[model samples]
Structure formats: structure tokens, C-alpha cells
Target chain A: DRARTVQTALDLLNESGLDTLTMRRLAQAMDVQAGALYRYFAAKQDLLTAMAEHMVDGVADAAGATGDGDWSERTARLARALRAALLAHRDGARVFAGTHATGPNTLRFADGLVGVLREAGFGDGDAARALYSVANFTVGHTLEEQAALTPGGGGPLDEATLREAVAAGTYPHLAATLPVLTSTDFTAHFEFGLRLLLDGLRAVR
Target chain B: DRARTVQTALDLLNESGLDTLTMRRLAQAMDVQAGALYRYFAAKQDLLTAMAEHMVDGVADAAGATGDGDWSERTARLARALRAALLAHRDGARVFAGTHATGPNTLRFADGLVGVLREAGFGDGDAARALYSVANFTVGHTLEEQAALTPGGGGPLDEATLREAVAAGTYPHLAATLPVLTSTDFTAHFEFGLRLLLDGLRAVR
Candidate 1:
């Protein structure tokens, strides 16, 4: 029931989240003992890795064929597809954060990203770091983006709270930029940063 | 005992980690019931926010005065300082991740980054996005960096494991880039992206 176990774990994750979806809780939901789960996943992280694999199983292929687009187009598509995959599930970004799954989903995406950068004239080191840069930004931004959607995720807060917090007159820059800073247009913010990274890559090239 | 409570929570967090540091556990460590702890923090996230605030208490000031250096220098200093603060604690980056802290430390750092960008000819939107971009990359990269150091934190694995996993020849790009990709040179990887964002900002300017 490895397949069933992973799928159910994801469903429960979406229903609630990472915190509540414990092994014991998963076992109960599956009508089994927590010890039985040890047969499928020896550790909590192992289950999480499988779950993360399922989440992005199609992401790499969805990014398109290796030769389908130029480096820039392909890279952007990979980033967008990845972001979409993570956003598809509740707490998906957080779930995928440290799983570091070596499943086909993850390996394929990693290969594609690295290959795309290499084909575009980046050496090995540059290509690898480029992949890391894109992946890091996407996951990092998505974490807060997801948190902002959660109750009391804390930090990101409402616009009013952010406005009031900086209204003490000491943080003029934050105050003046509050509209853009607190804007819910997370996608635009994402694209802006993605563009900067891509542009920076081009500069280095 | 509010101060002691928060301090003990951080102490416990460092000794174990975010996953192990629960409210009930923290209360026990503090010699109080969980309800008593609520009087100090209201919710788990509130405690987390306080913990994150304490972690970065001196980050903004350490970045130097708003006008002490050029925009690039000041911004890099802020980035490095923020990175250092997060690296100081176990899972510090994760602790700081979704907190969206509005504490003095957070506010001061936010204001400083935005101000540095503003002083460097970035508009409100540009400055705000720049801050997000930089922070996202830093936290994202650090998350994996910290995880790679943890046992079975997953993904960024030991060089040998990563090497053997992809030795199947299917992931040619990843295989070729393994040495650099899996290198522990996290700081250089970080600087590469940081420079990209900074260079991109300068380009727009």
C-alpha cells in the first residue's frame, strides 16, 4: 500500500497540514498501527519524501522537452511549473522544502534545470549554482506566500498590521513602500525576483 | 519569567529543533503548565515570533547605519548580517521563515534594506521587491544548507550518495555538475545569487 499510503498522506496534508499529519495519525487514518507504517516508511522523512515525490511527479515533464525552447524560455517554464506544482497543494511549498526527494519527479527536474543552464554556455559550477538560485527563490517566496494564506502563520501579517507597525515614523522607507510591500500580488513579486535572477544570469553569461 | 520562558524556549529549540520544540514541551522545560505559557505568548506562533525576534535582535544595527556605506555595500552587509543571525541557531532560518515578525529587529532590518535600495535610486516597488528577493534567496538557501548538515534531513545529500544515485547516466547534466553542485561551498553559492540580484538591481537602476 505504498501508493495508497503516499496518496492518503497527501490528502491528509491538504486537509490539515504538516503538523497534524503525524505517523500515528496517518496510521489511524489508514486503519492500521503506526508500527505497520514502519514497513512502508522507516522514518517520517521517508514518508514525506515519497509524498513530495507524488506532488511534483509530473512537474519536470510539464516543463517541456529539453530541446523544446531556448534556455531562457525553458528555464522560466521550469520555474513556473515548479511553483505551480508546490502551490497545487496546501502547505505544498513547506512539504517540499527539505524532503529532497530522489524520486523521478525530483531527479528529472534537477537534470532538466542543470542541462538547460549548461546548454546556455554556463560551466558546471555556474549551471549548478544557477539551479540552486532559482529553486531557492521559488521555495523561499512560496513559504511566506503560503503562510500568508494560513491563520496566524505570523510575520507576513495583514496590510493594516504592517502599516500600523511601521507607522512609528522611524521606518520611512517601509512606510512609503507599504503599498507595494504589502501588496497581495505575490505572483508579480515572484516574477520580479525571477526576472532579476535571470537577468543576472544573462549578465554573468 | 516571561523573559526566562522565551529564553528557555530558544534553548530547547537549539538543543533539539523546531519539530521537537512544542508548547507543551516548552512549558515543561519552563516548569509551568502549557496554559501558563499562553499567558506569555498567547499562541505557539507568538512564542516563535519572540524567538525569531531574539535571534535577530542585533541584525539591523549590526548592518551599520543607513548611510554608512554605499547602497551595494550597505545592502550586502545587511544580507550577510541577516544570514549570520539565522546561521547562529539550529533551524534559525526556519524559525525566522514564516514569522513575518514586526518586532523592532525585523522592522529595523526591513526599513534598512528598503531604505538602502531607495537611496540607491530604486522606486518604492523596486525597493520592496528587492528586499523580498534577497531575503527569500538567503532563507531558502540557508534552509537547505542547514538541512544538509542534519542527519537524513533529505535532498542535499552527501556527495557519495548524490553521486551514486545519479550514476545511472540518465541525469547527465547533474552527474557532470556533481562536484560543484554538491560541494559544501554554500557561502559561494549564496554570493553568486546575491550578486545576481544586486547586479540585476543595478541594471534596472
Candidate 2:
């Protein structure tokens, strides 16, 4: 029943967004009294925290299933897995962004990531820093991806209108590559960033 | 009048946040009817887009003023200026992320960044991708840093607690540096990622 309630809440979050995922709404979706949810979560933040924990833990579990390998390979795979998990949810990166991973799941995920970095010859400080770097990049990239995927996600001004504004050539470089800049190729960008960051880690050593 | 209205709306956004930055509230803040603000900004989103353009353009101007002397130095200085600009406003990075820059200011900023990258021996495609990588990293890093700076910074679950949690041996490599894992030095982390990314760019060439 608790799992069911959590799932319902997650669905509402995905459908209506985190801001609208109220206890009353969750209860209504679950066909239970709003008070009943208190037994499962003390507050809305608690529920969010729980959901975050679940998401991270599930990701760690996914990472664990991958065969043991070189530290770099393991680290990359874990990063990819983490990205996949965040991509699966609505505003998942934003939700995860506001959280501190005190939950068991989040902790496990962090531990696994730190471990891989250490095994790859990073000292404790460097390992922690590397983990933080990779996680930040992944989340940041994913957050942009989520926003781009949304309907009317193009902020306020559309790209074509924006291009017309730029065509006057006050900014040469920007005008030079409107085609590339406006393209919705987030996947290529993500891969490029990941490779660049990984290559940097190698160069740093 | 439009400038005054945008300034008022910006003030309200900084104080109340993104969701509360309504046209009605903005007009109220400006001591005008809601319809009056619309005469300046077609909609709330238009206002935000303008704010984003203004913010990035301001940073680009700052970049043009800095005397960094070399490609790497210029890149770093420009990046720092950009990060500072984003940090200056509430939810600034969130507001700017994924909003492609066609505005003159943003375009100028991108042009400058690409120019620096190109002078550093990067070809057109490489320069564009490199700038994208670095900008995203800086923005992502800044967002997390600002968000985590208060409310206990949602830091990595505290070192001692993290240590105890990891000592369980489920993650052997992670258990090794439980002490370092919980440290909260995001400034250092940001510099490290930025430098590492630069180093990676050099390696690619």
C-alpha cells in the first residue's frame, strides 16, 4: 500500500509537475483520505525526500548489476545510468537538484561513484571532487534536456524570431552558427560534454 | 516605462521566485494596472526572455572589458563573469539554462567565447562544442553552488554520518574515503571542473 501511494504520487508529479503534487491531490488520486498519507510521509517535503531516495537507490541498484570492470568504465556506466534515471522522470533533475542525499539510496549511489573514482587512482580529495564534477555535469545537462523536451519549452522567444534579431550582425560569432545553436540535438551535446570531461580527467592525471 | 516595469518585475522575481513573477504582481509592484505592464512586455515569458538576454549581454560586456591576455586566461575570465552574472539574480541559472541566445548581448557573449576558443587552436566545430561544454559546466556548477550555499547547503549528508552509512561494506571502494566524500568545498570543486574541462579541450587538439 505504501509503495502504491508512492507510485501514485510519482505519477502525479510526472503528470502535473512537482509544484502541484499536493497531499490532497495525491490522496484524491489514491482514493484515500488526505490524512492517510501522513502514515506514509510526514510532510510533502518528506514525500519528496522519499521519492528522491527511491530514485537514487534504484539507480544504484542498476549500476550494481553491471559486471565488474575497470574503474573508468564502471564510473562512466554509472554516470550513464544516473542520467537515464533522471531522464525517466518529469523535472527529475530539478527535483534531485534541490535535495541533499541523506537518504540511504542517495548515499549508496554516491558511495558507488566515489568508489569508482578512487579505484581509478584518484586520491580521496580528487575522488570526491571528481564525483561531484561528474554528477553536476550530468544533472545540469539533464536539466536542460528536460526543459527542451517540454511543450513550448522554448523559453519566451522562438528561435526563428531570435535569428532574425541576430541577423543584423551586432554579434558575428552568434550569427555564424544559428543553425548549430538552435538545433535540438541535446544527445550529441551530452555525449560531447561527457567525452570532454572524461578526457580532461585523463589529462589531469 | 518598459524599463521601469521590467526592473520592478525583476525585483519581485528575486524576492518571490519564478512562480510568483506574475503580470498582475509585477504591475502591482510597478504601481500600475496589469494591462500597463503588458504594453512593455508582451507576456511574463517575454519579460523573462528579456531579462535573460540583458543578463548575458551584461556579462559579455564585462568579458570584453577584461584584459586576460591569452585564450585560456580570457576564457576563464569570461566564464567567471558569466557565472557571476547568473549568480547575481535569484533562480538566474534556472531561468537561463537551455534558453538559446539570440539576443544581441547573448550573441555577443557567445561570439567572444568562440573567438577565444578559436584563437586557442580550436576549429569552428570544436570551438562551438567547447564553448557549449564550458558554459554548461559553469552554469551547472554555479546553480548547485548557489542552491547549496544556504539551508545547510544540502551538503553531502555530513562527513560523520556519511562515514557511518558507508562503513556497512556494501560499497567497498566508497567506504575507503568516507571522510572526504562528505566535504563541502564547492568553490574548489568548481575551479577543478573548469580547469579539468580546459585541460580536456587542450588534449582533444
Candidate 3:
């Protein structure tokens, strides 16, 4: 029944996105009163946390298939898997962004990530710091990516507009860097940032 | 008048946050009909963009006081100033996160940040990439930080509960790293991640 409730909420999320996935609408889909839905989740935030936990489980599963690798490789693999899971559902990243999921799956994932860093010879503090850094970076990057896709979320400036702004000679450096700044290759961008982080870690190690 | 409208909107945001700072309410605050706002901003988003632009100017002003420094020092100062500017008002970070502010102040700030990187010997593409990484990181980090402070935002689990979960032996590394994971020192955390990115950039350079 708990699993059923979570799956229903996820389906609703994929169908209608975050804004419309209210308790009342979720209850309607479940053929229960809004009050009864509270049996599974005490509040909307609880339900969102459950959704995030479930998403994290998906991340673990996908990351598990990457085969054995070094800590750096595995860290990158996990980060990529996590980003994919967040991108799967509409507003998935946003849902996870607000949650501090203490569920079993979330805990296990954290343990596993930290364990990878531990094996790489980082002390407990640094290991934990590294994991937090990566997780927050991924979450933060995806939130903006998803938000930009939303209506009125102010995506990258269109090329003509960008060109016009740069042509004014008011921002020479910006004009010079326009091609990279306006590129929509978010995948490359994500990897670039992640590499910078990992490279920094390697240096300290 | 447009500047006054944006200022009024920001005042409403500080008093009542993002949700209640609606066009109608902002109009009320300005002592005008809702329709009058359309002259200043064609839509709510346009008003929000103006507010964000104004906020970016604040960042530039504050960062300017940090005095000239090496690229690393300047980057940290600017990032700190940006975070402070976003933290100044209720939902300020959220507002700025959603805006692709191409206004003059926003462009000038970007140009200045990229110039710092250029002076540090980074090529045009890498300089822009580095700037984007830091900005996105700051935005993403603040979004979560602010959300955690909100009601039902699921902040770090309390120590007693966290200890109990870890005592189950299900998350060994997480238990070991609890101090770091559960620490609320977000300022330190932000700097930690920023250092990682900067260190990485230095390596490649």
C-alpha cells in the first residue's frame, strides 16, 4: 500500500508536474478522501520526500550497473545516474531539491557514496564533504536546468537578442564569450563542472 | 517610475515573500490599479527580472569594496557578495535563480567576472565556463539553503533521530560522517565547493 501510494504520486507528477500535484488531486486519483491520503503521508512535504527517496533508489539501481571502477569513476557514474533519475519525471529535480530524505534508501545511498571516498583515502570529514559537494552540485545544476524549461522560467537568451546586446560594445568580454555562454550543451557543461570538482579533489588527495 | 515599481515590488517581497508579491498586491503597494503595472512591466516575470537586475547591481557594489586581488581571491569575494545579495530578501535567491537577467547590470557583472578569469590567464571559453559554474553553484546552494529554512522543507534530521537511524547499522559511513553531514555551516560548505572548482581550474591552467 505504501508503494502503491508513492507510485501514484510519481505518476501524477509525471503527468501534471509539481504545481498541480496537490494532496486533493492525488487523493482523487487514489479514490480516497484527502484526509485518508494522510495515512500514507502526514503532509504534502512528506509525500514529496517519499517521491525523492524513491528517485534515489532508482539512482542507486542504475549506478550499480556501472561495473567496478575507481572511486573517481564511480563517483562520476553515481552523479550521472542521479541526474538522470531527477530528469526522468517532470520537476523531479525540484522535488528532490527541497527534500532532506532520511529514508532507508537515501541513507544507504549516502553511505555508499561516502564509503567510496573513504576507500579513496579521504578522512571521514573530507569523504563526507566530497559527497555533499557532488550531491549539492548535481541537485543545484539540475534545478536550474529544469526551471529554465518551465514557462516563464527565463531560459538562455535567444541568439539574435544575445547578438544585439553584445553588439552594443558595452560588454566586450561577454561578447567574446557569447558562443560558450549561449551554448545549450548542458550535458557538457555539467561534466565540465563535475570534472573541475573531481580534479580539485584529486589535487588535495 | 519603472525603478519605483521595481523597488515597491522588492519591498513587497521582503515583507511578504515571493508568493504574495503578486502583480495585484504590488499594484496595491504602489497605490495603483493592477493594469497600471503593465506599463512598467508587461508581465510578472518582467517585474521579477527588473528586481533581479537591481539585486545584481547590489552584488557588484558590494564586491567592489573587497579591493583588487588575485583571481582566486576576487572570485571568492564576488561569489560571497552574490550570495549575500541573494540572501538579503525573502526568496531573493529564488527570484534571481529564475531570471536570465540580460539587463545592463547583469551583463556588466558577468563581463567583470570573466575579465578576472581572463587576467588569471584563462582562455575565453574556460573563463566563461568557470563563471557559469560558480554562479550556478551559488544559486543552487542558496535555493536549497532557503528551502530548508522554510516550513516543512525537511532540513537535516535532528541528532537523536539521526543517531537512531545510524545505530541500526544500515548506514555505517553516514553514521561516521554525521557531524559533517548534519552541520548547518552552509557558509563554510559553500566556500568548500567553491574552492574545489577554483582548485580544479588552477590545475588545468
Candidate 4:
């Protein structure tokens, strides 16, 4: 019942935009009185927190369930799973990016990610930072991707514009590399950072 | 006059939150009619785009002015400066992250980042990706920092709780490296990524 309500809210959020997600509207979506949700969630923030957790829970589940592979593969798998989860919801990454997560789902995901790194030979300290490093990378990357996906939202730099900008002699190296930047193979780009951080972790030890 | 109006809006935004930033409100803050402001910006998004540009322009100016140096130092300096700019504004990273930028300030920063990467020997394409890598990392890192900075946020995970969570037996490696997984120096963690990425770029070709 809680999940159902949350799903309705998410649908409404996507369709109506963030401003219209009042309790009354949400309750209307659930075909219940606005006050009824209070039994399940104390406030709007509570609901938002749950939504954030639910989104990450899916990724945590994916990362946790996948079989162990080479460290790099495992890391990449987690990164990919995380990205997929963020992409699943409308404005999903935006919803999750700055929101706090204390729910069980959020912790489960964090625990699983930490577990993966610790198994890969990172000491406790390095493991945590490495988890942060990779998690931040995923979150950051998705935020931009989702923001750009919005209609008429070109974002800071699209491929064609960026290419043109680079060609103008202002950013020679950036211009030279326009092909790779414009390609938007986020998964590959993500893997690049994941591998680099993992390599850094290995070197540090 | 435009700068003063924008700065006034930024102040109000900090005090009242993003939702409260209305053209009328901004005009009131600036001792001008709301319609008068429209002569400068066509709409709210225009204002927002300008605001975003202002937030980043300083970083661009700083980054642009810095002489080309060793790749790692240049990268680190740029990252730190960008982080500072984002941290200075309320919801700074989120605001910038939400919008795409084509303003001179934003372009200047991008060009500067690309310049630094190119000077370090990255091919044009690789340098562009490298710039994305840096921007994504900074945005991602700053988002977390802002979330953590929110009042009443939970304390960071300490050793005892982490140990107990690990002892629950769901996360073997995390349990073994509980210390590292929980303790994080965000600043250092960011640098770790910056260096890793720069190293990765250096290795690219």
C-alpha cells in the first residue's frame, strides 16, 4: 500500500511537476483522504525520503544480487546499476541528488556498495572513500543526463554546440576531443572514472 | 545595475528559498518595478541563466587567469575554485546543475578547463571528456556536501555502528574494512578523484 501510494506520487510528480505535489493532490491520486497518508508518512519530506530510498533500493538490490567478478567489472556493474535506477524515475536523479537518505533502502544500497569495495582489497578507510568516489561519480553524471533530457533543456553544452565552441580556438584540446565528448556514451565515461579510482585505490595501498 | 539586481535576487534566494524568487520580489528587492527588469531579461529562465552564469563566471575568470601548469595541479586548482564558487551560493550546485549554460561566463569556464587539459597533452577529444569528467565530479561532490551541510543532518557513520552493521553479516568486506567505509574526508576524497582522473587522462594517449 505504501509503495503503491509512493508510485502514484511519483507519477503525479512527473506529470504535474514538483510544484503540484501537494498532499491533497497525492491523496487524490491514491483515492484516499489527504490525511490518510499521515499514517504512513509524517510529512512531505518523509514521503520524499521514502521515494529516494525506493529508487536507490532497486540499484542496491541489483548490485547486491549480481555475482562477484573482477574488481573493475564489479565496480562497473554497480555503477551501471546505480545509473539505471536513477534513470528509472522521472526527474529521478534530481529528486535523489540533494535529498537525505536514512531509510533502510538507502542503507542497504550503501552497505552493498561498501561490501563490494572491501572485498576488492580496499582497507576500511580507502573503501569508504572509494565508495564515495564512485557513488558521487554516478550521481553527478546522472544529474546532468537527466537535466538534459528535459524538453527544450539543451543543458550547458550539447555535442554540436560544444563542437562548434571547441572549434573556435578557445578550447583547442576540448575541440580536439569533441568527438568523444559529444558521443554521450555515459556508461563508458562512467567506467573510465570507476577504473581510474579503483586504480588509485590500488596504488594508494 | 544588472549585477546589483542579480545580487539582490541571490540574496533573496538564499533567504527565502528557490520557490520564493519571483520577478516582482526581485524588483521589490532592487527598488525597481518588475517590468523594468524584463528589459534586461526576457523571462525568469533568462534571469536564472544569468544568475548561473554569474555564479560560475568568477571561477572561469580565476581558472582562465591561472597560467598553465602541471596537469594535476591545474586540474586540482580548477576543481577547488569551482567547488568554492558552488559552495558560496545557497543551493549553488543544484541551481547551476538544473540549468544549461551558454552565457559568456559559463563558456569562459569551459574553455579554460579545456585549455588546461589540452596543454597537458590530452588530444582534443580526450580533453573534452576530461572536462566533463571534472565538471561531473565537482557537481556530484558539491551536491553531497550541500546535503550534508543541511541542518539536523545525521552524524557521519562511526566505527561502532559500522562494525555492528557489518557483523550482521550482509557485508563481509565492508565489515572487514569498516573503518575506511565510514570515515570520509570529502575534500581529500575529491582530490583523490581529481588526481585519478588527471592520471587517467595522462595515460589516455
TM-score leader: 1
lDDT by residue (tens digit), candidate 4, B39-92: 988888878877877887677656544455566677678788888888887777
Tell me the tens digit of each residue's lDDT in model 1 across B1-205.
Answer: 7778888988897899888999999978877789999888888888888888888887777557656877888888888888888888888888888685578888888887888888878898999889888888888887777877766545433333466679636889988999887788888988998888888888887
- Fnat values, candidates in order: 0.69, 0.49, 0.58, 0.46
Candidate 3 regions with alpha-carbon error over 4 angstroms: A27-39, A61-67, A151-164, B24-39, B61-67, B151-165
Q: lDDT by residue for model 2 over A127-178, one digit each (tens)?
A: 7777778878888777766766666555312334436666524756656666
In order of lDDT, best first, we have 1, 3, 2, 4
Candidate 4 TM-score versus the reference? 0.86
Give the local distance difference test score of model 4: 0.70
lDDT of 3 at B48: 86
| Candidate 4 or 3, higher TM-score | 3
lDDT per residue for candidate 3 within A150-205, as digits (tens), equals 65445323223345568427787878888887777778878888888889889877
Poorest 10 consecutive residues of model 3 chain B by lDDT? B152-161
Error of 3 at B142 (Å): 1.3
Q: Which stretches of candidate 1 lie over 4 Å from their true place?
A: A33-35, A156-161, B27-36, B156-161
List candidate 2 stretches off by more than 4 Å.
A16-20, A61-69, A155-170, B13-28, B65-67, B98-102, B155-184
Task: Give a tens-digit lDDT track for model 3, residues B102-147.
Answer: 6776666667788788877899888988877777788777776676
| Location of the lowest summed lDDT over 10 successive residues in candidate 3 chain A | A152-161
Clashing pairs in 1: A100-B155, A154-B99, A155-B99, A155-B100, A155-B101, A156-B100
Question: TM-scores of the models, in the given order?
Answer: 0.93, 0.84, 0.86, 0.86
Model 2 residue B137 lDDT?
Answer: 80
- Using DockQ as the measure, which candidate wins? 1
